[PDB]
Structure formats: C-alpha cells, structure tokens
C-alpha cells in the first residue's frame, strides 16, 4: 500500500510544517518504506532533519 500517505497522516498531529517536508520530498522517503518496513524507523529520521520536537 501507499505507506507514504500513511506516514504523512501522522504528521497531522505535529502540525502543518513537518508534513510539508514529506509532501515535498516524495522520492528519498519512499525508499525508507522499503528499507525498514516500519514507522518509528522513519520518524526517527525526521527530528534530525528538520528539528521537530
């Protein structure tokens, strides 16, 4: 399934700033979906990128 749209649905809780990133970058993140096959593994690579707390 399109985990990309799912992983972005959670960002809705953070706001409308961190969600823009995922939407903007729809090529480098799509790989993470077929690398770890998880969510916590992806989010961990977001707090270091932008800096969401």
UniProtKB/TrEMBL annotation:
InterPro entries, A to Z: Bacteriocin_II_aureocin-like
Stated name of the protein: Lacticin Q
Native source organism of the sequence: Lactococcus lactis
Gene: lnqQ
């Amino acid at each position: 399934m399109a985990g990309f749209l799912k992983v972005v649905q959670l960002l809705a809780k953070y706001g409308s700033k961190a969600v823009q990133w995922a939407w903007a970058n729809k090529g480098k993140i799509l790989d993470w979906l077929n690398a770890g096959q998880a969510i916590d593994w992806v989010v961990s690579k977001i707090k270091q990128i932008l800096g969401i707390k």
